[PDB]
Amino acid sequence: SMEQVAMELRLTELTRLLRSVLDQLQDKDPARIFAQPVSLKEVPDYLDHIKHPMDFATMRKRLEAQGYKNLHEFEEDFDLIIDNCMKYNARDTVFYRAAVRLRDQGGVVLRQARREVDSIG
Q: Domain coordinates of the chain in residue numbers?
A: 1-121
Residue 95 to residues 18, 25, 40: CA-CA distances in angstroms? Answer: 25, 16, 17
Residue 104 to residues 12, 25, 53, 70: CA-CA distances in angstroms? Answer: 28, 11, 21, 22
- Assigned CATH topology for domain 1-121: Histone Acetyltransferase; Chain A (1.20.920)
Contact 98, 30 (CB under 8 A): no
Contact 88, 50 (CB under 8 A): yes
Residue among 103, 109, 121, 101 nearest 31 (CA): 101
User: What is the CA 95 to chain-centroid distance, rounded?
Assistant: 16
Residue among 64, 62, 56 nearest 32 (CA): 56
Structure solved via: X-ray
Q: What is the DSSP letter of 99?
A: H
Which value in Å is the resolution of this experimental model?
Answer: 1.5
Contact 73, 21 (CB under 8 A): no
Contact 81, 102 (CB under 8 A): yes
Q: State whether residue 6 is helix, strand or coil.
A: helix
